[PDB]
Design a binder for this molecule. Structure first.
Ligand SMILES: Nc1ncnc2c1ncn2[C@@H]1O[C@H](COP(=O)(O)OP(=O)(O)OP(=O)(O)O)[C@@H](O)[C@H]1O
Ligand SMILES: Nc1ncnc2c1ncn2[C@@H]1O[C@H](COP(=O)(O)OP(=O)(O)OP(=O)(O)O)[C@@H](O)[C@H]1O
Ligand SMILES: [Zn+2]
Ligand SMILES: [Zn+2]
Lengths: 232, 244
């Protein structure tokens, strides 16, 4: 904790709910961001700016021109370079003081489990129902909190599933896209990760839905499934 | 419209509410963003990626280290370089095919006036009651929509005020030109909290320009601590030195 670091995190450090204590927890944490698209992009950005000690940025894919409409971490000049690489380099410029691990690949089976295990919080930012279901299993297995989100068209979806698993996991539950609608969701995944890592009390047993056209939120009570392939 | 453009805005074009015609509107619109900090930085980012034809970015400050915790558009390498310049520069790399203008100053007097004029929509991204109150004055005078927001600690505030002023203006809700007792908590602010807010200013600017039907004259509050939203109905103050 030197002059540079104090100034760097000043707007958090002076907050009663974060403070030196929280900043210290953040700097000792490691978050896994599976997927660096519309969601993961702003998320990684805010968690790096917040000073999360270690960020594992996982993604097996390259930038694309259509990507530049909502994936704010990239520029046109990165158009064909891999994402996990670009992100990692661009985030290092933002905060050179933290650990930024590029995991250029599609996480599955063991590779996934090794990552989920070595993580404090996992952010599912992949927009693929299958991956999620796998991620969920890894998280429930290794009792590691999972923050997952969706975003299609003008609507968004968010869940925070944590270790006691009191309201079940994702298995118990189960076009285009406007830039901002994915961003809000992404940025929100970050807010929850920070609040979780710094110990801030926050509601978790629910599915937060967003409708960006009407501009209103909704919530659905989640409930663990009596006899489930995971939470047992 | 182009073919390269079609690809870039594809995810947006495929939307029934935006479609190709709407994308043209976005590409023919001009958005003034006063302030390039915690709110403006992500706002400018999402509007550029969404293809807003012209974007005027106004900011008199430089990039300071403490900013790098929430003003996602900048990097440490940018320390001390002026915000508007750095901002313009980086947006250009995101979308070279857009009109980006860098205003290195504090919009006031007439400067702020004719700038609001030429603007289709204005985004107040200044966290300063004063500036905010005169932006309101100018926006109501030159009948230009105004999307204002603010963030302190774990709380955020957003508000959309449209031309007819059916539900009043900012002055219709705050006669003074001085801050509220939101002076204590102001020890700082949570990154994602102000982020959500600026990003929402962008969503609302997109919908307004692409003529989508979305509420206004509603004060929207966000509690980052509990992660809950609230809406306070607004209504013109009979005798607002601005509306009335
Ligand atoms: N199992 C996985 N492991 C790592 N990354 C994944 C996995 N599944 C999906 N992803 C990545 O997660 C990201 C999220 O995708 P998003 O829907 O945001 O954009 P895209 O897939 O990049 O966008 P588009 O809709 O333009 O196809 C992508 O960058 C995708 O490659
Ligand atoms: N009248 C004005 N004209 C142009 N820019 C303004 C005006 N008033 C404020 N700003 C700018 O708007 C931005 C919003 O600042 P924000 O509250 O996000 O961060 P800061 O003011 O830069 O941060 P800090 O709280 O660390 O002081 C700043 O970059 C500020 O310089
Ligand atoms: Zn389950
Ligand atoms: Zn009024």
């Amino acid at each position: 904790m030197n002059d540079r670091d104090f100034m760097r995190y000043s707007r958090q450090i002076l907050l009663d709910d974060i403070a030196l204590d929280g900043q210290q927890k953040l700097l000792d944490s490691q978050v896994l961001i599976i997927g660096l698209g519309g969601l993961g992009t702003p998320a990684a950005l805010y968690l790096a700016g917040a000073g999360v000690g270690t960020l594992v940025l996982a993604d097996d894919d390259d930038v694309h021109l259509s990507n530049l409409q909502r994936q704010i971490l990239f520029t046109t000049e990165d158009i064909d370079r891999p994402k996990s690489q670009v992100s990692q380099q661009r985030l290092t410029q933002l905060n050179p003081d933290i650990q930024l691990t590029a995991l250029q690949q599609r996480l599955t089976g063991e590779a996934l489990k090794d990552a989920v295990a070595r993580a404090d919080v996992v952010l599912d930012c992949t927009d693929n129902m299958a991956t999620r279901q796998e991620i969920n299993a890894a998280c429930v297995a290794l009792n590691t909190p999972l923050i997952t989100a969706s975003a299609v068209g003008f609507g968004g979806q968010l869940m925070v599933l944590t270790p006691p698993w009191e309201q079940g996991c994702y298995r118990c539950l189960w076009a285009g896209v406007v830039g901002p609608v994915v961003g809000v969701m992404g940025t929100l995944q970050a807010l929850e990760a920070i609040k979780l890592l710094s110990g801030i009390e926050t509601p978790a047993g629910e599915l937060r839905l967003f409708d960006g056209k009407s501009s209103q939120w909704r919530s659905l009570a989640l409930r663990r499934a009596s006899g489930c392939p995971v939470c047992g």
